[PDB]
Design a protein around this ligand. Structure first.
Ligand SMILES: [Mg+2]
Ligand SMILES: [Mg+2]
Ligand SMILES: [Mg+2]
Ligand SMILES: [Mg+2]
Ligand SMILES: [Mg+2]
Ligand SMILES: [Mg+2]
Ligand SMILES: [Mg+2]
Ligand SMILES: [Mg+2]
Ligand SMILES: [Mg+2]
Ligand SMILES: [Mg+2]
Ligand SMILES: [Mg+2]
Ligand SMILES: [Mg+2]
Ligand SMILES: [Mg+2]
Ligand SMILES: [Mg+2]
Ligand SMILES: [Mg+2]
Ligand SMILES: [Mg+2]
Ligand SMILES: [Mg+2]
Ligand SMILES: [Mg+2]
Ligand SMILES: [Mg+2]
Ligand SMILES: [Mg+2]
Ligand SMILES: [Mg+2]
Ligand SMILES: [Mg+2]
Ligand SMILES: [Mg+2]
Ligand SMILES: [Mg+2]
Lengths: 50, 118, 203, 78, 124, 132, 49
RNA sequence: AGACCUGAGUGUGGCAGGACUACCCGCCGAACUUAAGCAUAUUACUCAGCGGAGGAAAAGAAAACAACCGUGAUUCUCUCAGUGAGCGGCGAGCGAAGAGGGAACGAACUCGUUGCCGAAUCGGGUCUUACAAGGCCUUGAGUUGUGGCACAAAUAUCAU
């Protein structure tokens, strides 16, 4: 709630950044296979627990 | 016959030569620069980071995470030749360590953001 | 020569003189640790024949091994399945004490290449083998071709694999003829050899 | 009872993050990683799960020094 | 534009460390710009100016590794150099046997190489 | 049903099949054509390396042992100290000029060494041994 | 090894000479002592010089 | 009031652990299954378990086979041989070896003993183009034996 180690804090911060959409300069690339991010977590759906 | 006034035998205090102070475990060069440019990495421009330059005399730099409130002051003075009184820090929910920095009330903060180009 | 006389004292190992020497020396051995570094070997005759020279880089250890048959480790002394395995105390460990002695010294002292070992003493409780070990990186060992071979890296834990003479004993080697038709080169090399299902291309 | 009600009593943590295995199997009370046996020098590794060995072998990660040293020893140097 | 290494090798340590602290400050304020405006002309100098600090720390390390090698790779007494400068090669290539042995033989093994050498005979 | 079949005795009851659970214990020779090429490639490449020496050494005639084979002659390894002594050559020096030496054969019948003593001096005739 | 019943073969070494002639026995052994790696290497050197 | 012996302490110089494990080596080691039941047996000297190396490992130079007109390290292969061997509730099942044709193979060697030597050894230096298959200083190890040489009542050993 208020106690999280800094290491456990560094690992949720690395997840708050991974939870951004694919930028719309990626899907005009020549031959990419990416249309969606397909690794977006939602805090309710699935939990990280770390 | 040596005088032992103890129930135990504690190890005798023999001579203890010091180590040799090996030369170094590295070659890689260092400087005065990298010690002060790694700490203060870039200032911050937000609705709150701007409201604190004018109203207060603070600045906002996104310092590196493993820095030190005493070494943000040294770094300021080494980079921006201004004094720092209170350096409040916080590791944001991005793993990035922000830093608020009072400029001694003698270096106007609004004269550095205009110098530093914030 | 000098060897002929030490070698014959130890062959008369049950006399009252040699058994006095062993009755006092089996007594300090019982108040020393399991593994003990020695300066000289107790049996120079039997050590120097097993490949021990008194150069640098050669070290000798007494290792103590508890005597008697190994007891199968089954919870509560309870064994399950076929009564083939019903016994718990009468198994014998298929690896002689001298190999176990040599392998105790290997797990502990990983920087040494165990070479051989020999019998030094046994009471009715313990049994001490002096294991002849070599420091594979003392420059003496390095530049001496009689024992260079052990610096090579295939000999790192020859003790752990039964490559020492004590290991070569319980591996059924040391019989060559019809006496080891399934022992050669190993229990499984022969086993793989006899139980592979070979398929020629043209059958 | 022993279903949705008892699922409410799920307060603690049995396991936290393993400093060596990097996963969530570090049993707190008796401090050992349930998946790499940390602080045991040897990582746990059992042939009865080859599939889990494969999730944990070399090459499954970055493999920094080897992608380099395997290049030096395959070019006559070491 | 930036530092060109072919003309940068000839520089000295004290001359590099002033060359360095100036590319740091130049990039220090390019990450100020990168915050507020986009300014691809004012911006965009990062990737050349950040790989010029790279090829200065390179030549700095390329040099003070040699100076500390033409000082430790010496016939000096007890010649133990730091293990970071000792010719690196795999843990076992470092233990195995150098060339000066693995070819070394006793007496009564040299002397058969002479008495009874191997011959280059041919059969007719 | 069964009936008037030979009692099978097939001996395939020891997990030889490399199934999903067992690693298998079968030796299939799908590489023997590669190996025949592999060996003849080493052989023909070892022969031009040992050149001008003969690739194979000289081996004597020996009598195959049992009553089934005693009339069949065969090439055994090494000659003996005896043939070499009865032909001059030091078995230390015979073992370095292509002659193969066997310190274990016993020359039980003079008949035996006579075929081989003379078999040496054929070689020792048609051998150049040009010095270094 | 003072308590036990020391056999008559190992006892032999606990009935040594006395200090009377022991120093004399060490006098001979001392003056007829070998050459000390320095008068050995310069002795066989005069065997070439 | 010192040597030696047995132990310490840190100073230097190193090493070991860990990963990988298909193959390989040691130990450990089942059971399901088969026997139309099942306890011997079989599965299997297998799986799992512990340990340990290598590019291969292991084995290897006869305390071997044979009984012949003899063969001659190990390994591998075809074969002997699913065996008129044999083991086996002699049931289910199991089950090799010599020989033979091959592959490979310039494959052999060195300690200890023995005799003759007895520090010629080893290590720290140093000197030399790094030369440590050497020079020349070294008690520092070592005589509780490092090293050298010879191979049999038959040879020739042994020194200039
Ligand atoms: Mg120093
Ligand atoms: Mg101790
Ligand atoms: Mg000890
Ligand atoms: Mg001790
Ligand atoms: Mg003792
Ligand atoms: Mg010592
Ligand atoms: Mg071997
Ligand atoms: Mg065979
Ligand atoms: Mg706790
Ligand atoms: Mg621990
Ligand atoms: Mg493990
Ligand atoms: Mg002692
Ligand atoms: Mg001492
Ligand atoms: Mg140390
Ligand atoms: Mg450990
Ligand atoms: Mg290991
Ligand atoms: Mg059944
Ligand atoms: Mg079985
Ligand atoms: Mg297993
Ligand atoms: Mg080998
Ligand atoms: Mg068949
Ligand atoms: Mg069986
Ligand atoms: Mg044959
Ligand atoms: Mg000797």
């Amino acid at each position: 709630g208020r106690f999280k180690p800094l290491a456990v804090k560094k690992k949720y911060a690395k997840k708050m950044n991974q939870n951004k959409p694919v930028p719309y300069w990626i899907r005009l690339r020549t031959g990419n296979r990416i249309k969606w991010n397909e690794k977006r977590r939602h805090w309710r759906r699935t939990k990280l627990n770390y | 016959r040596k005088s032992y006034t103890r129930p135990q035998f504690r190890r005798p205090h023999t001579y203890r030569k010091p180590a040799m102070a090996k030369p170094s475990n590295r070659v890689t060069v260092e400087s005065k620069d990298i010690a002060a440019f790694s700490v203060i990495r870039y200032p911050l421009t937000t609705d709150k980071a701007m409201k604190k330059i004018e109203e207060n005399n603070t600045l906002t730099f996104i310092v590196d995470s493993r820095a030190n409130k005493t070494e943000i002051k040294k770094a300021m003075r080494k980079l921006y030749q201004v004094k720092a009184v209170k350096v409040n820090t916080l590791i944001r929910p991005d793993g990035l360590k922000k830093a608020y920095i009072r400029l001694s009330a003698a270096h106007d903060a609004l004269d550095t953001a205009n110098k530093i180009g914030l | 020569g000098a060897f002929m006389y030490l070698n014959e004292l130890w062959k008369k190992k049950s006399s009252d003189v040699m058994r006095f020497i062993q009755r006092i020396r089996s007594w300090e051995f019982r108040h020393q640790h399991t593994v003990v570094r020695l300066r000289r070997p107790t049996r120079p005759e039997k050590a120097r024949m097993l490949g021990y020279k008194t150069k640098q880089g050669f070290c000798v250890f007494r290792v103590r091994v508890r005597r008697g048959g190994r007891k199968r480790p089954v919870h509560k002394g309870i064994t399950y399945g076929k009564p083939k395995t019903s016994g718990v105390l009468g198994m014998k460990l298929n690896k002689n004490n001298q190999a176990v002695a040599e392998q105790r010294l290997g797990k502990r002292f990983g920087n040494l290449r165990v070479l051989n070992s020999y019998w030094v003493n046994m009471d009715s409780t313990f049994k001490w083998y002096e294991v002849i070990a070599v420091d594979p990186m003392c420059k003496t060992i390095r530049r001496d071709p009689r024992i260079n071979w052990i610096v090579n890296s295939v000999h790192k834990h020859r003790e752990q694999r039964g490559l020492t003479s004590a290991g070569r004993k319980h591996r059924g080697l040391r019989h060559k003829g019809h006496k080891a038709s399934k022992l050669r080169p190993s229990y499984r090399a022969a086993w793989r050899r006899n139980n592979r299902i070979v398929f020629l291309r043209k059958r | 009872t022993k279903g949705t009600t008892s699922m409410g009593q799920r307060h603690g943590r049995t396991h936290i993050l393993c400093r060596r295995c990097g996963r969530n199997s570090y049993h707190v009370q008796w401090e050992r990683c349930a998946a790499c046996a940390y602080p045991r020098a040897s990582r746990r590794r059992y042939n009865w799960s080859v599939k889990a060995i494969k999730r944990r072998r070399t090459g499954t990660g970055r493999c920094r020094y080897l992608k380099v040293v395997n290049r030096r020893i395959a070019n006559h140097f070491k | 534009h930036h530092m060109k290494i072919k003309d940068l090798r000839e520089k000295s340590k004290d001359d590099l460390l002033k060359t360095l602290t100036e590319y740091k400050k130049e990039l220090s304020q390019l990450r100020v710009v990168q915050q507020t405006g986009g300014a691809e002309t004012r911006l965009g100098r990062i990737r050349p100016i950040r790989k010029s600090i790279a090829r200065i720390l390179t030549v700095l390390n390329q040099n003070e590794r040699s100076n500390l090698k033409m000082f430790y790779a010496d016939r000096k007494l007890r010649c133990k150099t730091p293990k970071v400068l000792r010719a690196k090669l795999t843990h076992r290539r470092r233990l195995a046997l150098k060339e000066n042995e693995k070819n070394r033989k006793t007496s009564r093994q040299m002397r058969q190489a002479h008495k009874f050498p191997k011959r280059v005979y041919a059969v007719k | 049903p069964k009936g008037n079949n030979a009692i099978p005795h097939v001996h395939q009851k020891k997990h030889w099949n490399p199934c999903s659970s067992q690693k298998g214990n079968v030796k299939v020779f799908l590489n023997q054509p590669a190996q025949k090429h592999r060996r003849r490639r080493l052989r023909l490449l070892k022969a031009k390396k040992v050149f001008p020496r003969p690739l194979k050494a000289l081996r004597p005639q020996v009598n195959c042992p049992t009553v089934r084979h005693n009339m069949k002659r065969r090439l055994g390894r090494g000659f003996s100290p005896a043939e070499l002594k009865a032909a001059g050559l030091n078995p230390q020096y015979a073992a370095t000029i292509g002659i193969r030496v066997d310190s274990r054969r016993k020359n039980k019948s003079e008949e035996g060494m006579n075929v081989n003593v003379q078999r040496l001096k054929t070689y020792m005739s048609k051998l150049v041994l040009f010095p270094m | 090894q003072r308590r036990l019943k020391v056999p008559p073969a190992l006892n032999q070494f606990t009935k040594v000479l006395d200090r009377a002639s022991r120093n004399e026995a060490l006098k001979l052994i001392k003056k007829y002592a070998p050459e000390t790696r320095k008068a050995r290497r310069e002795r066989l050197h005069k065997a070439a010089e």
